[PDB]
Amino acid sequence: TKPHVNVGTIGHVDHGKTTLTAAITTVLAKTYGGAARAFDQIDNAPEEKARGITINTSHVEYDTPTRHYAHVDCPGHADYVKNMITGAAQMDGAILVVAATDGPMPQTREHILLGRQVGVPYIIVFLNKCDMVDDEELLELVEMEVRELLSQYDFPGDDTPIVRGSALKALEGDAEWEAKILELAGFLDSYIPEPERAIDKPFLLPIEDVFSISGRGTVVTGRVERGIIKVGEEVEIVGIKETQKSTCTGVEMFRKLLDEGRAGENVGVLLRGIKREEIERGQVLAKPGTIKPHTKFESEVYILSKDEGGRHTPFFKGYRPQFYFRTTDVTGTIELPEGVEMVMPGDNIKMVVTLIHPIAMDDGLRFAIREGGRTVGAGVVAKVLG
Ligand SMILES: Nc1nc2c(ncn2[C@@H]2O[C@H](COP(=O)(O)OP(=O)(O)O)[C@@H](O)[C@H]2O)c(=O)[nH]1
Ligand SMILES: [Mg+2]
């Protein structure tokens, strides 16, 4: 099967993301095979529901000779904010569209900054509307502006592929400009490395339940998030309390006794030496020395709007909600950015959080913000602090 890669268009409004998305599907369909999509179908994005969050998202698919791509395009900036923090698939790379007529605009900066925060790993640039620009001096100056902006947020601007093109003329059928769509698709193939598959990451299992099995000791159940756990291998129980070491003495799937549990499977793991009461809501099983527990972190959060089922009134710096990490709520206190004293429903802000219990975490881990039982926001860990 062809490798699967998740991409999407980002960049400022009216710079040509949707026209480019249509052009890519159209050009690749007539060149390497597939199904073309038209501008109107993609611009008219369905409402996708992620929890209570409403995100207008168009999903499109296209193939290169060697890869299958799932591409995400959204109508408005508000959708890109929501999608980057809580969208169905995390982008493996992004196509930043920049209109040569306008140059980098405020959401060009914001989407790069968000990409950095939510951990978007590769960004390719399509410099659009070049059918309007005859001057090569201008095009060079815009290209340098985009490279500086990428580097400002630690992307490798100097080595970043930038394709000078015209999404519109390519969608209209002009073969000269279509070649630029193939150049861009070439860069998707060559510049975005194939992402790391979960089965190859160090073992991780969020604990959902614990039982004292008769004559066999303590078992913890959960979905293997990544890696492989084998009978005989050592594990760490990470989070809430001081970290404990243990050994796997059995892997059970329903009534079937296994020798290993793999990423994606729902299993029960028998642990030597651990008593049922030594296990707490919110802990994970992990390969030893691969994930650490933290109480403090920086995050990018989106606060739900009233219509989405969230808060009706803003909160202030004393806000003390619950942060739901994998399996449980942990209370935290927050610090706001300087100048911000109030956070309105529907806002998104950088939030420094201090939980009252440690949670095993790494950059890019998603969480929900909750009040009482109900969800009021969504975040991504941008930087762990300790
Ligand atoms: N002249 C020219 N116009 C373009 C090009 N790409 C897009 N446009 C026009 O710019 C407008 C906005 O494009 P659109 O894809 O909807 O922008 P989006 O908000 O980023 O999705 C539309 O009128 C497009 O047809 C291009 O390469 N050349
Ligand atoms: Mg659009």
Author numbering: 9 to 394
Q: How did the manuscript describe this experimental structure?
A:
The N-terminal domain (G domain) is a guanosine triphosphatase (GTPase) that is followed by two β-barrel domains, important for aa-tRNA binding. G-domain proteins generally function as molecular switches by alternating between inactive GDP-bound and active GTP-bound states. We provide structural and biophysical evidence that phosphorylation of EF-Tu at T382 acts as an efficient switch that turns off protein synthesis by decoupling nucleotide binding from the EF-Tu conformational cycle.
We recently showed that the toxin Doc from the toxin-antitoxin module doc/phd hijacks the natural posttranslational modification cycle of EF-Tu to target translation elongation by phosphorylation of EF-Tu at T382 (21). Therefore, to study the structural and functional effects of EF-Tu phosphorylation, we used Doc as a tool to produce pEF-TuT382 in vitro. The structure of the pEF-TuT382–GDP complex determined at 2.8 Å shows an open conformation similar to that observed for EF-Tu in the GDP-bound state. The binding of GDP seems unaffected by the phosphorylation of T382, suggesting that long-range effects do not affect the GDP binding site on the G domain. The nucleotide adopts the same conformation observed in the crystal structure of the nonphosphorylated EF-Tu–GDP complex. In addition, β-barrel II is slightly closer to the G domain in the phosphorylated protein, with R59 from the switch I region directly contacting the phosphate group of pT382. Phosphorylation of E. coli EF-Tu at T382 traps the protein in its inactive open conformation independent of the nucleotide bound to the G domain. The electronegative charge of the phosphate group of pT382 would strain the closed state of EF-Tu significantly, suggesting that the presence of a phosphate is incompatible with the closed active state.
